Design a protein around this nucleic acid. Structure first.
Ligand SMILES: [Mg+2]
Ligand SMILES: [Mg+2]
Ligand SMILES: [Mg+2]
Ligand SMILES: [Mg+2]
Ligand SMILES: [Mg+2]
Ligand SMILES: [Mg+2]
Ligand SMILES: [Mg+2]
Ligand SMILES: [Mg+2]
Ligand SMILES: [Mg+2]
Ligand SMILES: [Mg+2]
Ligand SMILES: [Mg+2]
Ligand SMILES: [Mg+2]
Ligand SMILES: [Mg+2]
Lengths: 219, 184, 142, 258
RNA sequence: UCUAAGGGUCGACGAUCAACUU
RNA sequence: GAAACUGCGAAUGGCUCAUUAAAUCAGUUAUCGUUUAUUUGAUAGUUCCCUACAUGGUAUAACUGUGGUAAUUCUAGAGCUAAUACAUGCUUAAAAUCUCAGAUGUAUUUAUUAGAUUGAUGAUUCAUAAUAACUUUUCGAAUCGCAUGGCCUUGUGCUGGCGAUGGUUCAUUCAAAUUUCUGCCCUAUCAACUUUCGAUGGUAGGAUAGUGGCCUACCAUGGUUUCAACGGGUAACGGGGAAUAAGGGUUCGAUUCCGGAGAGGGAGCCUGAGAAACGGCUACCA
């Protein structure tokens, strides 16, 4: 009986091995999203409210987000669902998934910390991970670092130094949707091609109408 | 699924045909729409060649044309009063091409008033230009006093998602009025 | 056709509108066409009151395939006959022929009047029934 | 059979490619393009079998990917581009221009032409149709649509196509007494003058052609291509000018080289 | 809860009347 | 430049001949009875009810870390991250007529009109245009590369190349699906068959990409047949062809090409332009 507990705030997670039934009956019959607290589960966690979202049973089947059963059943799974990755465009497979309501069958639960009650866990706030990637889009960097539209956002893009061969040439990410004279020239080229084509069609039609009104003059 | 093939459907001599060529997707049929009235619900069907059909279920409004003054107002379908193929469609008010329905007639009366100004059913001299020759008929206006105009569906709701049609007029209207005063 | 309006639906040619506003002469505007290939549109088709959406002159079908000739052997269907098409089939081993025939179901417009006998000319049209792919175009009541 | 075939087995290719039998199992399947599958001639075939410039298909694509070959003014880097009748194959490395025309045996003859007449090409007007917005257009034998055509250009006429602006400079009208190439049938590759056109409403149009030597052969209108008037072809004719000598006089011409 | 078909009398239809069987 | 997302392909090929006897197939037709990715050619000044010097995550992958199962090309939980993925959304006057300032591109649906004697066809209710409206919104590039040029209010100026990819419609091509006519071996110890339960036709509808009893409702009583229907057999896939052959024929053709069908037996279906796909899925049987 294991507990994969994750702290999304600032990034963290770790696993516990709760080997007593009395201190884990607080999860039985809870399906998804309940205020199961630290004081209710074990002495160590206290004031920690666990968002109980997912888990795996013995024989390794994951949980299904909304099946609402205490056993495992077979579903025809599709593209945009959990527990299945389609190996081919349009593929669907009948896979046995485990229900949403927790019980003893679960070999491991998956909990999300949503409230901090008392003394921090040693893998909860002290040790934290950075965000692996900074924003890539121009407006994403603007929305991140607060700078407004007219701020010339190509300067403080988060970088990374590679201590590999004593040269450490920083790999700054390319930014997309950036307002650039190349894109402005592409826009101008398209919006000028359109009017050029329209004028060409108009003059071709005019001269053909001239030909018609000339060859109609014969009577 | 449903197949439109003729490999079943025994030959004209009456012989039962042997089977080959397990059902092909290019011969498939599908389920009828059985378009009802009210609270528009249209489902997109993916058809051959990547095209799309629109299965109308529960259609509420249709575009109906008078065809004598050429207006084609958008109006509400009240119900089905006659269907030449199945009385069950009349019973169930199933919207379908060639169904004889009743329409609101209010946009048509409003257009008649804004056009002729001649008190149909109860920029100055345009009514004068559209002169006294405005008498429509003795059966298309008597329905305006009840606010229900007999119309015939012309689109295919199960195919195009729309329930457009035209107002009954002349000998068509006389035919359907005879049918209605018989079966009603 | 003996009270042409004998169906549950109103029988009419599509998009052929008799405007009750305009005071035209006939009041029953009737569409017809020239079928092509030198088949004269009959006056029964021109002036009748039948509808026959499968008529080659007043209907929505075209004659665009094979032109065949045959002998009418049945007129027991509604607007459909069966023509017999006799021919001789060559058997090379005997350097001789054998009589063969093929019945062909054909749609006959009310423009024509056809009885048993009555060698007819028929033109291919789109499939208009399970077995019918031909429309009578010349009655030639021999 | 579940979709379009992408292979062309040898012995299923069009015979006029003169393809070797025991070379491989497959022939170059003409990609979709201007002319047809059967009436076409892939660039690989014309580069590796009609000129021997390349030795393999690999070398054909090597020649093609550096923009050497050019079909009707454009690059056409497609290894199996379906070039066909009246097409201009110009190569600037080894600067020379060919016009794909039919010899009298019915194959695509190698016909060098000069730039001053490779500038343009000919096209048989497949159809005259009004397009959207009421704009008339012509469709030619090579699949070209040309808007605002001359109101006197009808079906079966021929139009001279600029091939740089793609417009109609002149048009020859199908009538008794004009020079016509035969582009199909038994007489594929013959040249002659229209004598008479049999109508056959519903059926197929027939045309009687009289070559220079007064031989008179009939053929379907589908595969006759007006190329000008007698003695003034709007294009340059290949080495044989479509005379169709019989086997006896062909052997005689051959033995005249001793 | 309906639908259809199967009648009488009177003057291609109209008016009136009537009972059940499917 | 691994991985991954996206795109395209995987419906070709290759195998086999089990089914299959008017079925396949062959030659010959038709689509004025339809779909068609791609290729090729042409084609789109009309979009708005406080971003366009460029909109959002409402989004996610790969990746980072925590795992379950003995096992699968199984995946959960948490943190990022883009687009030619997804979803939105403007800039183009001028010209331009109708309605009583607004509408007028295209796409969908309906009705009406012209389409003559002002284009085409043997032939159309054709192409096409117009009118009045209609749409669980379609399209009308918020994309990418290599060069950077010219003029200049010398600035974040105005312009301007060659392309790639994408996109509406039309035509073209590769195709597909139906389709005309005629032609299949033995058997009557198979002579009547089909028709409630669609058999043949009519009307209407539904369904289809489209025609069509393809299906449904109502109606008619038809349709095939000694010129062999229907049934039975085939150790029958059809043909190009092969063996033998004075001539005529007899026999063969699972098999190098074309067409068909199938992937143990059936059935159903996702994706996609295209599969009723099986080196795709779903179920049952073995
Ligand atoms: Mg294959
Ligand atoms: Mg039209
Ligand atoms: Mg029908
Ligand atoms: Mg055999
Ligand atoms: Mg067998
Ligand atoms: Mg064989
Ligand atoms: Mg065998
Ligand atoms: Mg094969
Ligand atoms: Mg298959
Ligand atoms: Mg096996
Ligand atoms: Mg299968
Ligand atoms: Mg296998
Ligand atoms: Mg396969």
């Amino acid at each position: 009986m294991k507990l994969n507990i994750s702290y999304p705030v600032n990034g963290s997670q770790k696993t516990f091995e709760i080997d007593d039934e009395h201190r884990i009956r607080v999860f039985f019959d809870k399906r998804i999203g309940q205020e199961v607290d630290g004081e209710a589960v074990g002495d160590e966690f206290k004031g920690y409210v666990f968002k109980i979202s997912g888990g795996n049973d013995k024989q390794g089947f994951p949980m299904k987000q909304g099946v609402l059963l205490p056993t495992r059943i077979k579903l025809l799974l599709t593209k945009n669902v959990s527990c299945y990755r389609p190996r081919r465009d349009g593929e669907r497979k009948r896979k046995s998934v485990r229900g949403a309501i927790v019980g003893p069958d679960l070999a491991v639960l998956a909990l999300v910390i949503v409230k901090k009650g008392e003394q921090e866990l040693e893998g909860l706030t002290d040790t934290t991970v950075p965000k692996r990637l900074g924003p890539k889009r121009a407006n994403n960097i603007r929305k991140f670092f607060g700078l407004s539209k007219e701020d010339d956002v190509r300067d403080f893009v988060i970088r990374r130094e590679v201590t590999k061969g004593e040269k450490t040439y920083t790999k700054a990410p390319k930014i997309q949707r950036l307002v650039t004279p190349q894109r402005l020239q592409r826009k101008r080229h398209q919006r000028a091609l359109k009017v050029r084509n329209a004028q060409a069609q108009r003059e071709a039609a005019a001269e053909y109408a001239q030909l018609l009104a000339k060859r109609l003059s014969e009577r | 699924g449903i197949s439109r093939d003729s490999r079943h459907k025994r030959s004209a001599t009456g012989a039962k045909r042997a089977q080959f060529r397990k059902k092909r997707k290019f011969e498939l049929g599908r389920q009828p729409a059985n378009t009802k009235i009210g609270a528009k619900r249209i489902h997109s069907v993916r058809t051959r060649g990547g095209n799309k059909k629109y299965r109308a279920l529960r259609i509420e409004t249709g575009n109906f044309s008078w065809a004598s003054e050429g207006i084609s107002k958008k109006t509400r379908i009240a119900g089905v009063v006659y269907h030449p193929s199945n009385n069950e469609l009349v019973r169930t008010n199933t919207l379908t091409k060639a169904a004889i329905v009743q329409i609101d007639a209010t946009p048509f009366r409003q257009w008649f008033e804004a056009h002729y100004g001649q008190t149909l059913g109860k920029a100055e001299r345009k009514w004068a230009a559209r002169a006294a020759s405005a008498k429509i008929e003795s059966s298309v206006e008597s329905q305006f006093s009840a606010g229900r105009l007999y119309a015939c569906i012309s689109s295919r709701p199960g195919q195009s998602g729309r329930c457009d049609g035209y107002i009954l007029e002349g000998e068509e209207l006389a035919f359907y009025l005879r049918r209605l005063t018989a079966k009603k | 056709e003996l009270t042409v309006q004998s169906e549950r639906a109103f029988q009419k040619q599509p998009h052929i509108f008799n405007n009750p506003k305009v005071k035209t002469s006939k009041r029953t505007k009737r569409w017809y066409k020239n079928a092509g290939l030198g088949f004269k549109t009959p006056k029964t088709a021109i002036e009748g009151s039948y509808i026959d959406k499968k008529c080659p002159f007043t209907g929505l079908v075209s004659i665009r395939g094979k032109i065949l000739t045959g002998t009418v052997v049945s007129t027991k269907m509604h607007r459909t006959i069966v023509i017999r098409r006799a021919y001789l089939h060559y058997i090379p081993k005997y350097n001789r022929y054998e009589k063969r025939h093929k019945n062909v179901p054909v749609h006959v417009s009310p423009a024509f009047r056809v009885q048993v006998g009555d060698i007819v000319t028929v033109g291919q049209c789109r499939p208009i029934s399970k077995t019918v792919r031909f429309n009578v175009v010349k009655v030639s009541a021999a | 059979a579940r979709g379009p075939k992408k292979h062309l087995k040898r012995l299923a290719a069009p015979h006029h490619w003169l393809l070797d039998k025991l070379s491989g199992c497959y022939a170059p399947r003409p990609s979709a393009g201007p002319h047809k599958l059967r009436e076409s001639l892939p660039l690989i075939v014309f580069l590796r079998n009609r000129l021997k410039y390349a030795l393999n298909g690999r070398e054909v694509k090597a020649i093609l990917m550096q923009r050497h070959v050019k079909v009707d003014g454009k690059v056409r880097t497609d290894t199996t581009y379906p070039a066909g009748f009246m097409d201009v194959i110009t190569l600037d490395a080894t600067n020379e221009n060919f016009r794909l025309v039919y010899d009298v045996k019915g194959r695509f003859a190698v016909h060098r032409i000069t730039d001053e007449e490779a500038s343009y090409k000919l096209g048989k007007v497949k159809k005259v149709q009004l397009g959207k917005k009421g704009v008339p257009y012509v469709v030619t034998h090579d699949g070209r649509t040309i808007r605002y055509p001359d109101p006197n250009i009808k079906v079966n006429d021929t139009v001279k196509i600029d091939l740089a602006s793609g417009k109609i400079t002149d048009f020859i009208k199908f009538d008794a007494g004009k020079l016509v190439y035969v582009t199909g049938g038994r007489n594929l590759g013959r040249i002659g003058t229209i004598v008479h056109k049999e109508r056959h409403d519903g059926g197929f149009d027939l045309v009687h052609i009289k070559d220079s030597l007064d031989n008179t052969f009939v053929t379907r209108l589908n595969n006759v291509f007006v190329i000008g008037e007698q003695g003034k072809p709007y294009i340059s004719l290949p080495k044989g000018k479509g005379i169709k000598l019989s086997i006896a006089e062909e052997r005689d011409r051959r033995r005249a080289q001793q």
